[PDB]
């Protein structure tokens, strides 16, 4: 029934989990009907229904409106009761909300845009093993975005040659180096060997520079036993941070890892491999912000957030990832006011074709609480990894200094970089190739 | 506003936060032990502080024990007798720290410890 | 029956657990009847009574006398047989003696004032993990009260900023810093992070001063699994002391923690949070001395004992906590001669609005075997924590030196402090604000 | 007042609220007393954070009708002050220090508003009322139990013998006295063995599921769990714990074990009167009751004034309880589906009290008869039968529409006509 | 070979007084004896764990003494830490902590503790590289009289 499930006068409860769906009904399906279907098919005739009160377990579409997106498209708001969800289980939340409704015939397409996670539910999750503040304090780093570099080539390098690249990058000024998402354990490089050599690299660069260093050691594995075995050895090595591909590994496994990291003081870097399979298309799937909120709940200290070179949408989920209270702002993809009631924030990681000239914009857009992850941006420096890292570290600090003085990074970006090239041969050499 | 020093003022527990004791003040502390029926004893070391070299488990520290100067002065009734031993220790080991400790056969335990000399 | 349970000619056995109750009978209830009721209702018609000998399991009121306290008030002495109690269980002792009688209708009010713990029962308890003597030897501290400071503000500080305060206080001359009783693990500061930073602070201050330092790391938790997990990490860090709120956490949990500390060489600082809920009123509840004896039995190396600025009552339970043999002295709240047969003593902790000017009195009243815990007394120093700690350490030693020379701290207190201000700018500055 | 007295503060849905009955010292205004209660129970380094964000605050003060110098001060504590899932920390934070403040002659915590956001961090009852009924297959009537007497002095076997006779006669449960843990006369493992034989012997005989609250209360958490573990091995349905004397940290661990192993948990409130007796100082039982529901328990003794009891009974059993001063409910309490706890009535009750007990507590309760069973002139089985008959007679009458409050005695007298067991019981207990 | 000592009988001293000394004062005596030239110091047979001196505390202070004297003299030192206990669980618990401390030798009163327990301890010592000093307390109860009992040589072969 449209009005069993379509309740336009329903007032959401502070304990409801709310969802904003972008719905594309099939021809001949009224919006009210589509909305009701979305709610009904993602929630609740058989005699057993008489042994309880279905009304207290049904999801309900309390609002639907034509959207400006495209052809016969609408945003439907659905409210789900708190009791439907298993405490601390992102897996069950996803299963309950997006487990079945996307295949409904009456819908040509469907995409989950946002979720309002009430305090009564979020409080049942540990959340980030540490969070932005704790991480800065643990690593003793303040006043600037963090810097990192992904080791290349992806596969093919020996564990030792891999560590060599790590050391050179780190000693040059980067805070972190990182295992590619595909690097777990393979014939050309078994994981334990990589952990050993990367540990030597981490400590060599730290002793040389005097600054705390780290390398996101990928613990992503085929099984939970293997995943933990890798985290355990990193723990033995005393390194500060490990890594996991939460989507390919899965939420059940990620949550377990997040708990291990909390119990052992390990920072957890989260890569979002395979997200585009789900969040690329505007008409169907789940927008990344939903996957981002899910990660903050399941647990992660860093999370890849994409590149900056749409901006407003990125800034939108960045706030959803770092802030305690985010006000409704559909212009930035925020369909619901979100209150995290003190759950720690996650540091967003920007990566993808970024180089020294992008430093002003990146610093400007993300602010200090971010990680700027380079690739060839550092490994492609004509003088090698150490000079490349130095060029990026110098470029970044030049931007920070200028911003702190009140200069406009968005307008004076190029001059700030050009000016820094005067006293930094490394930066100058980088600005000549890019 | 004065900033508390970070070096040069290492300590030796009880009384080490007071200015250097004079011979008279030192005698008074010794007399305190004698009047309390406690046995005075001197200890010395070229290393004056605690450290952790052999273990880091709860309650374990190295550098707590120092070396005994001769033996506990049982039956001592003249505080100046302790001063005499203190002077001999200083002469034999001028580059060593020397502290005065006290024992109680009643509490069956060490109950006193204060620095008496520090090398130049 | 009054004379089944009221036995005024009964001679207590050396194995009986004796209790002194302050009883306020309802109007119309004779004192003999009230006393008999107290004994009967806190101990032992059904045919099963014939399958044993109830006389050997009944508690008995062997004495009752009108008390000088107030309106129709009496002190009733009750004797309980050794066999009623489970060995090593403070929980069962409390359950057996104060588990039911306080709600008896015939009594307007009831308060347990004291307990005579026979050697046959106390010997079934481990007691303090270490005790006064062992602690002094372990930390190599003799001839003076120990000094500590509780970190403020209570909640709101980050784990790192918390550790910063710890280090500054410790490096100034204090032996310990401490987690507020409310500080366990919360959104603003998770426990493991606090342990990490406080450990850095402990070791930094120790290396700088050359004196052994510590910080009471609170292990109080919602469950025994969490409580032990915290003790275990402190053990890994190699720190000397942990903390527990024995009343809010409970005796079953405290005893387990005391056993863990003994098995791992950890000192155990005991906070008495919530004691005033039970021991404030003279007419009803349980006097702190009972809660103190209970802690010595369950296990603790330090225990908060209140402030000194009634004195005789405080001194009374202080002896009950530290000494091996305490003679009956009702003027000091000691209703029974107590023999601990060598169970180690607990160091009493004085805290609450105390500052440098109180040093003479505190040293005088408590003697060397105590811990003087400051708050703003050190954190409120105009030059900061380190100078504040130095002022308190100087003030204390000045008092010790003067006392050792035979001076009267109770009469020469102010002069002793004023004299020390001459060579200690830190103390002088403290004596100007307080 | 202060930074602490904010009479127009609007409480947040996440705040933990407290209602304190405060008795100020002479010369201490109610406003100041209230602010003090809030300040003393909450809060150069202050400059590194926000004191307002962590301060407790008295948002309302009112006098107590009919009382001299007594007021109710309402205080709001931010959610961030409390450790999730820890009743121990909640007690420490709210009542850990304020009761000794000199400016106050006396202080009593009357109620606590537990916000859903905080309660959702607690497992709560291992099973709860509904699950227990389905597990034991018992419906439509209060449950019946008996505490084995004499308390101490019996051998493990004689103890079990009494268990068997009580259970075979119609009682659902028999129980260990709160003081019965493990002692010289009867060690716990022996008692568990014989009580297990009794439980299964009576169950096979009657055809109804039986249980015996095996006390796991102990000196250490290691001993407590060891006892629960053997009960688990024995396959029995229920164990017990004295939560106040054992403590919340221990009780919570036990509640978790019970949930993980399918064991019902009977909670005894030994020592509660030391804290909740006096009206001027301490903590009202309803606070201790909410604390137990949060920490974990399937049963909890609630005693045998009337309106106040009904008040915390609802707080223990229901999902949503609206504020009601007449019943001592200072705050509207929403448990957001946390299971309820079955209240246990005990203390000097016998067959003639069945009508009133049934009428006041209703079906979801346990009526515990000590001497009311063991005191029967014909023994435990006949004694149990009399109580079971008396109860069912009341249930039948109530179900037919009769007024238990006005026809109670007449209902019992009629049952004595066909129940020789009940007749004998009534002759002795008048 | 383990202690690097050859060409002479080894030397040791039993700490006195037997009972009454605090764990720290006990360790103090250990250090002074060892630094003077003795290879070992030792816990009296009666010294296990008591009110005046609990075992773990003694192990801690004697370990400090062992290492202080060794660093000072340059020669390997040891102290027979008595693991004799009321139960096998306690006996092993003491051996385990000595193992953690990295000391070279522990001690057991094989006759009062018993052969079943001694054999278990001997196995633990082999598995963990600990030397085992054996005291023969109570032997005279059995081997004193020529007419009845068991001569010590039998008790020796047994050990
Ligand atoms: N010397 C040469 O030959 C040159 C080399 N390069 C340079 O080499 C460097 C390579 O590193 P960089 O690109 O920074 O980072 P990486 O290659 O390490 O990629 C990091 C992230 O970029 C995103 N990404 C990159 N490739 C794609 C793709 N095919 N489709 C979707 N997303 C993509 C992904 O983001 P997410 O996980 O968020 O989806 C990925 O996680 C750059 O500086 C590039 O300009 C290019 C030109 C010249
Ligand atoms: N044969 C005879 O000699 C007779 C025997 N008795 C009878 O024997 C039976 C005994 O069992 P019963 O009383 O039902 O229950 P229990 O003795 O098993 O007590 C159960 C609960 O009653 C409360 N209680 C009982 N005594 C007191 C006390 N002294 N002060 C405060 N609270 C008290 C406590 O409640 P909480 O834990 O909630 O505080 C206790 O947990 C009754 O039926 C009684 O009438 C009495 C007269 C005659
Ligand atoms: N700068 C400023 O604004 C000023 C600050 N303060 C100062 O700040 C410092 C605070 O530290 P301090 O008071 O020493 O110790 P804490 O606040 O750390 O309290 C320690 C103990 O004092 C007792 N206590 C304190 N408040 C109360 C209360 N409300 N009711 C009952 N007991 C209480 C409790 O003892 P137990 O656990 O034994 O019950 C508590 O455990 C003091 O020196 C105080 O004078 C005050 C005036 C000025
Ligand atoms: Mg990659
Ligand atoms: Mg405090
Ligand atoms: Mg009972
Ligand atoms: Mg000997």
CB atoms within 10 A of CB E81: 26
Find out whether C273 and C178 touch, Cβ atoms under 8 Å.
no
Pocket of ligand 2 contains residue D241 by CB under 6 Å: no
Find out whether A221 and A249 touch, Cβ atoms under 8 Å.
yes
Contact partners for chain B, using 3 or more CB pairs closer than 8 A, are C, E
CB-based contact, C379 to chain D, within 8 Å? yes
For residue B62, the distance in angstroms to the closest alpha carbon of chain E comes to 6
Closest CA to D356 of D326, D387, D394: D394
D326 burial type by CB count under 10 A (0-12 exposed, 13-18 middle, 19+ buried):
exposed
Give, in words, the CATH class of D1-122.
alpha beta
- Asked if the Cβ–Cβ distance from C192 to A133 is below 8 Å, we say no
Secondary structure (3-state) at C148: strand
B17-52 CB burial, b ≥16 within 10 A, e <16: bbeebeeeebbbbbbbbbeeebbbbbbbeeebbbee
- Asked if the Cβ–Cβ distance from C398 to B64 is below 8 Å, we say no
CB-based contact, E63 to chain C, within 8 Å? no
Closest ligand to residue A304's CA: 1
What technique solved it? Answer: X-ray
Residues 6 or more apart whose Cβ sits within 8 Å of residue C196: A138, A265, C159, C237
Pocket of ligand 2 contains residue D348 by CB under 6 Å: yes
Q: How far apart are CA C315 and CA C305, in angstroms?
A: 10
A312-339 CB burial, b ≥16 within 10 A, e <16: ebbbbbbbbbbeeebeeeeebbbbbebb
Q: How far apart are CA C72 and CA D279, in angstroms?
A: 19
**CA distances (Å), A345 to each of A301, A334, C186, in order?**
8, 17, 15
Q: How far apart are CA D348 and CA D345, in angstroms?
A: 10
User: How many CA atoms does the CB half-sphere of C364 hold within 13 Å?
Assistant: 19
Q: Alpha helix (H) ranges present in D243-379?
A: 243-246, 248-261, 272-276, 285-295, 306-317, 354-361, 371-374
What sign results for the dihedral spanned by CA atoms C122, C124, C127, C130? positive
Site residues for ligand 3, CB cut-off 6 Å: C 150, 272, 276, 304, 306, 351-355, 374-377, 380; D 40, 97-98, 100-101
Q: Alpha helix (H) ranges present in D68-148?
A: 87-95, 116-119, 129-136
Pocket of ligand 1 contains residue A178 by CB under 6 Å: no
Residues 6 or more apart whose Cβ sits within 8 Å of residue A11: A62
The structure was resolved to a resolution in Å of: 1.9
What sign results for the dihedral spanned by CA atoms A29, A30, A35, A41? negative
Closest CA to A173 of A138, A144, A200, A199: A144
C126-434: what fold? TIM Barrel (3.20.20)
Which value, in Å, is the radius of gyration of the alpha carbons in chain A? 23
Q: How far apart are CA C92 and CA D181, in angstroms?
A: 7
DSSP string, C264-282: HT-EEEEE-TTHHHHHS-S
**CA distances (Å), D128 to each of D260, D264, D266, D292, E40, in order?**
14, 8, 11, 12, 64
Torsion angle, alpha carbons of D50, D51, D52, D56, to 10: 140
- What is the distance in A from the centroid of ligand 6 to the CA of D147? 7
Order of strands across the sheet that contains D16-24:
D57-63, D71-77, D16-24, D104-113, D282-283
Q: Which residue has the tokens 């400051």?
A: C374
Find out whether D81 and D93 touch, Cβ atoms under 8 Å.
yes
CATH number of domain containing B82 = 3.30.190.10
Q: How far apart are CA C376 and CA C392, in angstroms?
A: 11
- C91: part of which helix (H) or strand (E)? helix C90-98
Name the token pair of A325.
């209270």
Secondary structure (3-state) at C245: strand
**CA distances (Å), C94 to each of A264, C131, C294, C321, in order?**
38, 23, 9, 18
Domain ranges of chain A: 1-125, 126-434
Q: Which residue has the tokens 């109570």?
A: E138
Residues 6 or more apart whose Cβ sits within 8 Å of residue D305: none
Interface of E with B in 54-83 (CB under 8 A): 57, 60, 63-65, 67-68
For chains E and C, having 3+ Cβ pairs within 8 Å is answered: yes
Residues 6 or more apart whose Cβ sits within 8 Å of residue C31: C23, C25, C64, C66, C74, C76
CB atoms within 10 A of CB A2: 15
**CA distances (Å), D17 to each of C401, D92, D118, D289, in order?**
51, 15, 12, 16
- D410: part of which helix (H) or strand (E)? helix D404-416
Check whether domain D123-430 has CATH 3.40.47.10, yes or no: no
CA end-to-end distance (rounded Å), chain B: 29
- E127: part of which helix (H) or strand (E)? helix E115-128
Q: How far apart are CA D346 and CA D290, in angstroms?
A: 19
Q: Which residue has the tokens 């890798």?
A: A230
**CA distances (Å), C273 to each of C278, C294, D96, D393, in order?**
11, 15, 4, 50
Interface of C with A in 341-360 (CB under 8 A): none
- B24: part of which helix (H) or strand (E)? helix B23-35
Secondary structure (3-state) at A36: helix
CA end-to-end distance (rounded Å), chain C: 61
DSSP string, E22-76: -HHHHHHHHHHHHHTT-SEEE--TT-SSBTTB-HHHHHHHHHHHHHHHHHHHSS-
Residue of B nearest to E56 (CA): B59
| D14, D80, D120 member nearest A124 (Cβ) | D120
Chain B residues whose beta carbon lies within 8 Å of the beta carbon of residue C211: 11-13, 49-50
- What is the distance in A from the centroid of ligand 4 to the CA of A353? 12
Closest CA to E66 of C16, C429, B54: B54
Name the token pair of C165.
């305060």
Q: How far apart are CA A272 and CA A145, in angstroms?
A: 20
Q: Maximum Cα–Cα distance for chain B, whole Å?
A: 49
**C396's torsion region: left (phi>0), alpha (psi -120 to 50) or beta?**
alpha
| E24, E56, E93 member nearest C137 (Cβ) | E24
- Asked if the Cβ–Cβ distance from C240 to B58 is below 8 Å, we say yes
The three state secondary structure string of C335-355 is: CCCEECCCCCCCEEEEECCCC
Name the token pair of A123.
């409080």
Backbone angles phi, psi at C262, to 5 degrees: -65, -45
Q: Which residue has the tokens 């700690």?
A: C389
Closest CA to B89 of B67, B74, B105: B67
Beta-bridge partner residues of D11? none
Q: How far apart are CA E107 and CA E121, in angstroms?
A: 10
Closest CA to A287 of A104, A103, A21: A21
Q: How far apart are CA C300 and CA A294, in angstroms?
A: 44
Is residue A271 annotated as part of the catalytic site, yes or no?
Answer: yes
Find out whether C346 and C291 touch, Cβ atoms under 8 Å.
no
- The three-point CA angle A209-A215-A217 to 5° equals 160
Q: How far apart are CA C168 and CA A143, in angstroms?
A: 24
The number of angstroms, rounded, from the C-alpha of D350 to the middle of its chain's C-alpha atoms is 21
Count of structural domains within chain B: 1
C92 burial type by CB count under 10 A (0-12 exposed, 13-18 middle, 19+ buried):
buried
Q: 3-state DSSP: chain E helix, strand, coil percent, rounded to 5? A: 50, 15, 40
Interface of D with C in 204-233 (CB under 8 A): 217-222, 224
Find out whether D188 and D182 touch, Cβ atoms under 8 Å.
yes
- The three-point CA angle A411-A413-A418 to 5° equals 135
Residues 6 or more apart whose Cβ sits within 8 Å of residue D200: D210
CB atoms within 10 A of CB C87: 15
Residue nearest to atom 22 of ligand 3 (CA): C352
Residue of B nearest to C419 (CA): B18
Torsion angle, alpha carbons of E17, E18, E20, E25, to 10: 60
DSSP state of D23: E
Q: How far apart are CA B52 and CA A392, in angstroms?
A: 41
- The three-point CA angle E142-E143-E147 to 5° equals 95
Q: Is the peptide bond before D331 cis (omega within 30 degrees of 0)?
A: no
- A76: part of which helix (H) or strand (E)? strand A74-80
Residues 6 or more apart whose Cβ sits within 8 Å of residue C91: C250, C251, C252, C255, D181, D217, D218, D219, D242, D245, D246, D247
Q: How far apart are CA A238 and CA A240, in angstroms?
A: 7
Residues 6 or more apart whose Cβ sits within 8 Å of residue A95: none
Q: Which residue has the tokens 């327990």?
A: E117
Residue nearest to atom 40 of ligand 1 (CA): A352
Q: Please give the residue range of the domain that contains residue B36.
A: 1-120
Domain A1-125: give its CATH architecture.
2-Layer Sandwich (3.30)
Torsion angle, alpha carbons of C397, C403, C408, C412, to 10: -20
Chain C residues whose beta carbon lies within 8 Å of the beta carbon of residue E51: 341-344
Measured from the Cα of C355, ligand 3's closest atom is: 43
**CA distances (Å), A56 to each of A115, A143, C252, E19, in order?**
20, 49, 41, 73
**CA distances (Å), D99 to each of A261, C273, C339, D13, in order?**
40, 10, 32, 26
Name the token pair of A398.
């030049």
Find out whether C202 and C233 touch, Cβ atoms under 8 Å.
no
The three state secondary structure string of C155-214 is: CCCCHHHHHHHHHHHHHCCCCEEECCCCCCCECCECHHHHHHHHHHHHHHHHHHHCCCCE
Beta-bridge partner residues of E105? E131
Q: Alpha helix (H) ranges present in C280-342?
A: 288-298, 311-322
DSSP state of A9: T
Is residue D212 annotated as part of the catalytic site, yes or no?
Answer: no
Select from C132, C133, C141, C340 the residue whose CB has the most chain E CBs within 10 Å, as the one to mutate to test that interface. C133
Beta-bridge partner residues of C19? C78, C115
Residue ranges with strand state E in A16-55:
17-25
Measured from the Cα of D177, ligand 2's closest atom is: 18
Closest CA to E47 of E22, E10, E70, E29: E22
Backbone angles phi, psi at B41, to 5 degrees: -155, 145
Write down how long chain A is. Answer: 434
Q: Alpha helix (H) ranges present in D137-239?
A: 156-168, 188-206, 221-234
- D21: part of which helix (H) or strand (E)? strand D16-24
Q: Which of C58, C63, C130, C271 is catalytic?
A: C271
Q: How far apart are CA B14 and CA C141, in angstroms?
A: 7
Q: How far apart are CA C305 and CA C334, in angstroms?
A: 16
Q: Which of A269, A271, A355, A381 is catalytic?
A: A271
- Asked if the Cβ–Cβ distance from B4 to C390 is below 8 Å, we say yes
B113 burial type by CB count under 10 A (0-12 exposed, 13-18 middle, 19+ buried):
buried
Find out whether E98 and E59 touch, Cβ atoms under 8 Å.
yes
What does DSSP say about strands B97-104 and B109-117: parallel, antiparallel, or unpaired?
A: antiparallel
- Asked if the Cβ–Cβ distance from B62 to E68 is below 8 Å, we say yes
Pocket of ligand 1 contains residue A381 by CB under 6 Å: no
């Amino acid at each position: 029934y449209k009005l069993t499930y379509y309740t336009p006068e329903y007032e959401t409860k502070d304990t409801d989990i709310l969802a904003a769906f972008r719905v594309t009904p099939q021809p001949g399906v009224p919006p009210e009907e589509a909305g009701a279907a979305v709610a009904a098919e993602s929630s609740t005739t058989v005699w057993t229904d008489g042994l309880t009160s279905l009304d207290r377990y049904k999801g309900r579409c309390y609002h639907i409106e034509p959207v400006v997106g495209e052809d016969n498209q609408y945003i439907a708001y659905v409210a789900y009761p708190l009791d439907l969800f298993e405490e601390g289980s992102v897996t069950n939340m996803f299963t309950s909300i997006v487990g079945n409704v996307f295949g409904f015939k009456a819908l040509r397409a469907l995409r989950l845009e946002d979720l309002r996670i009430p305090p009564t539910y979020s409080k049942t999750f540990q959340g980030p093993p540490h969070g932005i503040q704790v991480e800065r304090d643990k690593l003793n780093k303040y006043g600037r975005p963090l810097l990192g570099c992904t080791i290349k080539p992806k596969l093919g390098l020996s564990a030792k040659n891999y560590g060599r690249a790590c050391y050179e990058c780190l000693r040059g000024g980067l805070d972190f180096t990182k295992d590619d998402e595909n690097v777990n354990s393979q014939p050309f490089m078994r994981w334990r060997d990589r952990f050993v050599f990367c540990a030597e690299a981490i400590y060599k660069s730290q002793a040389e520079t005097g600054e705390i260093k780290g390398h996101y050691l990928n613990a992503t594995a085929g099984t939970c036993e293997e995943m933990i075995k890798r985290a355990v050895f990193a723990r033995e090595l005393g390194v500060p941070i490990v890594m996991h591909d939460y989507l390919t590994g899965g939420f059940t496994a990620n949550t377990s890892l997040a708990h291990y990291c909390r119990d052992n003081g390990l920072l957890l870097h989260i890569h979002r491999a395979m997200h585009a399979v789900i969040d690329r298309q505007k008409n169907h799937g789940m927008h990344f912000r939903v996957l981002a909120k899910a990660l903050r709940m399941s647990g992660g200290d860093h999370i890849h957030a994409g590149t900056v070179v749409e901006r407003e949408m990125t800034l939108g989920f960045v706030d959803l990832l770092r802030d305690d209270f985010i006000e409704k702002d559909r212009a930035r993809g925020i369909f619901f006011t979100q209150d995290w009631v003190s759950m720690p924030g996650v540091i967003p990681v920007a990566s993808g074709g970024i180089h020294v000239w992008h430093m002003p914009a990146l610093t400007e857009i993300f602010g200090d609480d971010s990680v700027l992850q380079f690739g060839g941006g550092t490994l492609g420096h004509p003088w090698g990894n150490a000079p490349g890292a130095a060029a990026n570290r110098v470029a970044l600090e030049a931007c920070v200094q200028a911003r702190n003085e009140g200069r406009d990074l968005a307008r004076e970006g190029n001059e700030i970089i050009r000016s820094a090239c005067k006293w930094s041969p490394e930066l100058a050499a980088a600005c000549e190739i890019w | 506003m004065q900033v508390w020093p970070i070096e040069g003022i290492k300590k030796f527990e009880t009384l080490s936060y007071l200015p250097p004791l004079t011979v008279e003040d030192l005698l008074k502390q010794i007399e305190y032990l004698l009047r309390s029926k406690w046995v005075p004893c001197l200890e010395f070391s070229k290393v004056g502080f605690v450290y952790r070299e052999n273990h880091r488990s709860p309650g374990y520290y190295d550098g707590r024990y120092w070396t005994m100067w001769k033996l506990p002065m049982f039956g001592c009734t003249d505080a100046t007798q302790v001063l005499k031993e203190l002077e001999e220790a200083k002469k034999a080991y001028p580059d060593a720290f020397v502290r005065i400790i006290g024992f109680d056969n009643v509490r069956q335990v060490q109950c006193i410890s204060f620095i008496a000399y520090k090398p130049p």
